[PDB]
Every structure is written in structure tokens, then in C-alpha cells.
Amino acid sequence: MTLVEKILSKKVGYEVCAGDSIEVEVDLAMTHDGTTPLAYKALKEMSDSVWNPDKIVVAFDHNVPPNTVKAAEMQKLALEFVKRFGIKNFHKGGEGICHQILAENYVLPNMFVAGGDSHTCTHGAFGAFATGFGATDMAYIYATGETWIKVPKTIRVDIVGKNENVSAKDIVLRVCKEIGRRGATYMAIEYGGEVVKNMDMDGRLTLCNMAIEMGGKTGVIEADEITYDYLKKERGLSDEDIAKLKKERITVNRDEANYYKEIEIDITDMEEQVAVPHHPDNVKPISDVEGTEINQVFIGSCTNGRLSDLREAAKYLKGREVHKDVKLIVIPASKKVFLQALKEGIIDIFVKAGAMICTPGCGPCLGAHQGVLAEGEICLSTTNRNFKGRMGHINSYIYLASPKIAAISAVKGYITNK
């Protein structure tokens, strides 16, 4: 029995196998400024109320503040969803990215998280089963708190070795390379090993987030002490709640689980990994892409927008200034990350370096305004998507790398390690 089978079995109250179709109760339902309207429209035709407003989260992160009339009409319509259904857990523009809000305030281990977003798989780092759903599907979830899901197969990814010169994004890019953009199709990506157990919670959320970029239905990491300490830090979880959570802790024994595929990654010495346009799996080491001049550098997104991502980037921008031909865009993942990075003096480092700061949202990682590339512009982003013409013009280029590389490259003006 794999981890996803373990979680789902405890969820329904009986042993379940991969391939089965079971009814699962939803512990956490969420839509954002882009997926709320359609979900709301469908909900009007179906129900006059929701099943539990305390388990429903709504956040504005895609178009904040409204950059178009249409986006303004979207949030306007989403505002009525909060009103007409009495949604207490509503996060306005500036609160931050939806998944970051869910992580630092809501998601508990062994939960079944249902989200109106493709990258809902991010919250599998808590030891929960989190997948994305369509707007019509989320409507029924809002009205009943239930949904049907097929227990997916599991790809075991063992990350062993030790390398302090690389970050979690460098590792997850390495995993994307060996597996591919279609390698984990219809399958949950169960991370584990020496590195994963010693990896911080900010890093675990990075690995589970890019699960969709490998075709993965979701990503999941076993609940740990780091998971519990994170729950102690970001939220006021009492010791009675940690202990209550530890008795329900789910672990996986040896050979008690049969995986579809079991890949293993040695992290040493593996220099910093960089994804090459126009696909997330096109990952090359730093030496193979050295000297590549860039026009724009973005540091934010759900993948690397947390406090630790800004802190690392701030220590390389602490001395110098952003290159003349390079524009730096910094966007904290949430309102909490923004505040904490203010008092820490992290923001001061950025602004002095000439970095452009935007309100906590999904930045220009999508469509999206707030940082559009022109024809020919190269952007070294820290997000999780390299699709051709995603950050603007169809003939623009996007590179993916850690906040460390992004910070250093912004100074030098070219992709570098020194």
C-alpha cells in the first residue's frame, strides 16, 4: 500500500487499492479569482448554500490589482460568491498566492484538499492528498463537501545524497529531467529518501508543486517533524493538536507498497540546475548555459516566493545593484511573507538594488500583465512553467532557476553562478 493509498484508506474507513473509485469527503475546498466565477455560476443553479464555509477558501492572486476590465468583472463576480454564500475565509488582493495561503494557515496532514487550480498538488508536502478540479467539479464540492476520485498509481522518487550548494528547485528540476513532462501521467509522485526527510517545508512544497509539470495527477510527501514544526510556526497549533496529529501519522514500511515506477536520484555533486525553453524538463547544468544574457529576472511565484527564497536572494543583492539591461521583479508569495521580509530588511535590499516590487500574487507567471515579455526578450523566472510565449510574446524566452541564481544573474546581467 503506497502513501496515497494509505491516506485515502484512512479517509474512507477501509483499505483501498490503486484504480478504485471511491467517495471522499473534502476537508479543504478552494477557488481563486479565475476559477471562482465559473464555479459560482454553476453553484447558483445547484444549491442555495454551501456545506461548510469554514472549509472553503477564496483568494485573489492571478490579477491583483485588476489589470483589465474583464479581470475586474471576475473578482466582482467572485465577491458575490463570498456574499451570497457567506464565505468567511475570503482573501482579498494582496493576501497572496492561493496555495501559499492554504499552506501557512489551512492544510493539515492526511487531508483531502480540493482546489480550483492545476497546482493544488503543492499541498501534498503536508502528507495530504491534494488534486485540482474543474470549475463544475468544485461547484459540487462546495455544495456537498464530497467528491469522487480514482485512486492513482504511484511513482516512488528516492532522493539520496547530500549537496548544500543546491536548493530544492535545483532538485525538482533534476527530477523533471529524468522523468519528463509525461513520465508521471495519471500518477502520484511520492517523494522520499535522505534528502526529502532533511529538506525543509519550504522545499517540500517546491517539489510537490511541479508535479503537474511531469504529468503527475499530484505530488505527496510523508508527514514529518518538519511538517509539524512548520505547523507550529506558521500557525498556533497547540501541543494537544500535534500529539493528536501524531497518533494519526501515516508512514510507509519496506516492500509493503508496490510502485508503478521507482526512480532514484543521487544529488551529489549536481551543480545548479536550469530549465531551458520552452519546456520545464529541458534541464541543463549551469556550466551548459553559462553566459546567457537575460533581459528580465523574476523572483516570486508559488514555487519560490516564500520567506526563505527571498532571504537567500537578498544576501546576493545585499552588496550590488541590478544590471542596467536587466529588470528585476520581486513578488512575495503572501501578505505574511511580505510583512516578515519587511521587518527583516529583505525588501530594503531589493528596492535599493532597483528591484520592482508588486503586491503578493501570481505575478507574470501566467498571462498575465505585471511583467510581459516582448518579442525576443529572455526571462530568468523562478516559477514552474517554460511554455513558449507564456510570459508574453510567442517569440519570447523563459528560463527557470533557483532564487539564488536569479539574484546573482540579475546583478551580472547574464545567467551565472558567480
Please report, as ranges, the residues that interact with its own copies according to CB under 8 A. 64-69, 71-73, 75-76, 79, 92-95, 324-325, 327, 329, 335, 338-339, 342-343, 347-348, 351-352, 354-359, 364, 369-377, 392-393
Q: Is 121 annotated as a binding residue?
A: no
- Measured at the CA of 354, the angle between CA 169 and CA 359, to 5 degrees, comes to 65
Of 254 and 343, which CB lies nearer to its own copies in the complex structure?
Answer: 343
Asked if 277 contacts 399 with a C-beta cutoff of 8 angstroms, the reply is yes
At its nearest, how many Å lie between its own copies and the CB of residue 335?
Answer: 7
Cβ burial, residue 58 (10 Å; 0-12/13-18/19+):
buried
The distance of closest approach from Cβ of residue 76 to its own copies in the complex, given in angstroms and rounded to an integer, is 5
Q: Is 365 annotated as a binding residue?
A: yes
Q: Write down the least CB distance from residue 403 to its own copies, Å.
A: 18
Rounded Cα gap, residues 394 and 374, in angstroms? 9
Distant-in-sequence, close-in-space partners of 272: CB < 8 Å, separation ≥ 6: 165, 166, 167, 170, 285, 286, 401, 402, 404, 405, 417
Tell the smallest beta-carbon distance from residue 231 to its own copies (Å): 23
Give the nearer residue to its own copies in terms of CB position, either 256 or 348: 348
CA–CA separation, 3 and 236 (whole Å): 27
Report the residue number, 243 or 342, with the smaller CB distance to its own copies.
342
Tell the smallest beta-carbon distance from residue 212 to its own copies (Å).
Answer: 26
Residue placing its CB nearer to its own copies in the complex, 219 or 364: 364
How far are the Cα atoms of 114, 154, 275, 331 from residue 187, in angstroms, in the given order? Answer: 17, 5, 23, 32
Q: Where are the alpha helices (DSSP H) in 235-306?
A: 239-246
357 vs 366 by CB, closer to its own copies = 357
Nearest to its own copies of 154, 295 (CB atom): 295
Least distance to its own copies, CB of residue 363, Å: 9
Helix (H) or strand (E) segment spanning residue 189: strand 187-192
Nearest distance, CB of residue 349 and its own copies, angstroms: 10
Which candidate, 109, 132, 123, places its Cα nearest to that of 219? 123
Closest to 380 in 3D by CA, of 306, 318, 290, 319? 290
* 178, 212 Cβ separation under 8 angstroms: no
State yes or no: 98 annotated in a binding site.
no
Q: Please tell me the distance from the alpha carbon of residue 153 to that of residue 17, in angstroms, as a whole number.
A: 9
DSSP 97-151: -HHHHHHHHT--TT-EEEEESGGGGGGGGGT-EEEE--HHHHHHHHHHSEEEEE-
Closer by beta carbon to its own copies, 88 or else 162:
88
Task: Show binding-site residues.
Answer: 302, 362, 365
Task: Show binding-site residues for [4Fe-4S] cluster.
Answer: 302, 362, 365
